[PDB]
């Protein structure tokens, strides 16, 4: 309640920082060890669990280095030496994150991780990505880094172990910039690779390292997706575009799921109202120059058509307006078109004498 009148002056030196962490970027790591079991968030270096082994310390320290800014937060999950990955994955479903990597792993477990990521992205429509060692997956949510025998310091780090540094570097990059041609100071040397083989390897869709210009740098920022459908775009291979799109998709959830799920009748008028709300949200993002102008939001005609054909509806002799007016039970189909600017990666200069 009321106390005696108080005058207190506080002196604090809030100047103890360098290479400040970005607001965005969350990395989740799952590990096998005998101690410190459970989730142990790591905000910075000073708060590191002491009971961990040397290998886990090395992996965490590798993951603690960014490109320009350090990652916002680290969620380290520790599992016992003999355990299945399903329990850790189900526990991580509750938590939210951007990237997931596991330094020590086997061939069979990578299949489970890839399957989980695909199911989460498609069935549940939650946009997360994982960085994996040698997976040949054909999905935009999978990143495979396929160079071996990286010499950081005096140790021949394995590819799976260096996926941690890859994930940290990816998380550290700001939104405006990309991860192409970024130099790694720590790395010393790479096993020999000819230029044409590296070009073909990255064309297949891979994350690699090459020695070009002054020092070692990442060849390209492509994804694992290697084939393009009519609906899918060529811009979906770039990591930066996918990251921005997933940020936007996660942000629109506070508009969609918070209010329009379970609280509003599913009628075409309410669909139009929701479309207007989404467009008005996109205008603000356009005004901040995050995306390009002229972004349109409208009803997904083809998916609605497919769902209507799934049930007992004769799609013939129906007006397009009649198709759009149809009540699709308790599900809503929407489609948006937005554009994201890529970074400068190719230059063609012609000089006339």
């Amino acid at each position: 309640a009321i106390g005696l009148p108080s005058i207190n002056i506080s002196f604090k030196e809030l100047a103890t920082t360098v290479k400040e962490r970005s607001a965005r970027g969350i990395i989740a790591m799952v590990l096998k060890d005998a101690k410190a079991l459970g989730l142990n968030e790591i905000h910075e270096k000073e708060d590191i669990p002491v009971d961990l082994s040397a290998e886990n310390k090395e992996y965490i320290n590798l993951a603690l280095m960014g490109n320009v800014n350090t990652p916002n937060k680290l969620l380290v999950y520790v599992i016992e030496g003999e355990a299945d990955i399903q329990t850790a994955l189900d526990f991580l479903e509750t938590k939210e994150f951007n990237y997931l990597c596991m330094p020590k792993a086997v061939e069979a477990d990578k299949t489970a991780i890839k399957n989980w990521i695909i199911k989460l992205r498609d069935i549940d429509k939650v946009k997360v990505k994982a960085v994996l060692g040698k997976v040949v997956g054909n999905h935009e949510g999978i990143i495979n880094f396929t160079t071996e025998d990286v010499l950081v310091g005096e140790k021949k780090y394995s590819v799976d172990e260096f996926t941690s540094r890859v994930a940290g570097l990816i998380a550290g990059t700001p939104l405006s910039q990309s991860v192409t041609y970024t130099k790694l100071s720590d790395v010393v040397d790479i096993p020999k690779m000819t230029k044409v083989d590296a070009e073909s390897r990255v064309n297949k869709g891979e994350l690699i390292l090459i020695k070009e210009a002054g020092a070692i740098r990442i060849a390209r920022g492509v994804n694992s997706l290697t084939e393009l459908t009519a609906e899918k775009g060529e811009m979906f291979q770039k990591i930066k575009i996918v990251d921005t799109l997933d940020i936007i998709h996660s942000d629109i959830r506070k508009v969609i799921i918070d209010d329009y799920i379970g609280k509003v009748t599913n009628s075409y008028d309410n669909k139009c109202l929701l479309i207007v709300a989404i467009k008005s949200y996109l205008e603000e993002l356009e005004k901040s120059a995050l995306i390009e102008s002229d972004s349109t939001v409208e009803i997904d005609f083809e998916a609605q058509k497919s769902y209507l054909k799934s049930k007992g509806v004769d799609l013939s002799y129906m007006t397009l307006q009649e198709i759009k007016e149809a009540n699709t039970g308790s599900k809503v189909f929407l489609k948006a078109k937005i554009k994201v600017l890529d970074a400068m990666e190719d230059i063609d200069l012609s000089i006339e004498i």
């Binding site: 775009g233 379970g262 509003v264 009748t265 309410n270 997904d300 998916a303 929407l334």
Partner: protein
Amino acid sequence: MLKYKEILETIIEILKKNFTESIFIDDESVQGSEGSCFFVSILSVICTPVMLNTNNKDIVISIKYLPKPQSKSIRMYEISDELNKLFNRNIKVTDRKLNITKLEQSIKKEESIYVLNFTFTLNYLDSVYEEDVVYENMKEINLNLGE
């Protein structure tokens, strides 16, 4: 909505309470009566749509007094005042009050005898019927974005 039968019943009940002479709705009974009978009918109804779901109604209600015995015109002039005293501002029909916009009265001779004709108009807004489909609440919202 509001039914015309209820309005007619309400007016007939008011006249029954306030007057001792009989009230009839049809011509044959007033013809067969011995004298001094009333007559109540709804003259006309006009419906105009002012909004999507509502109409505007103007109803003209006619009250007639036909005194058969001789030298009852003074009774007609007495009855005019008592009729005037009742229908001043509004009437209540089925827990709803309807305004009375204007009153009109005329004394004219019909066939061989003079009669009194008392009329007034009611104005109110009323809603047409419609059938509305029921939808269940939104549960799953799919949004896929591309180029």
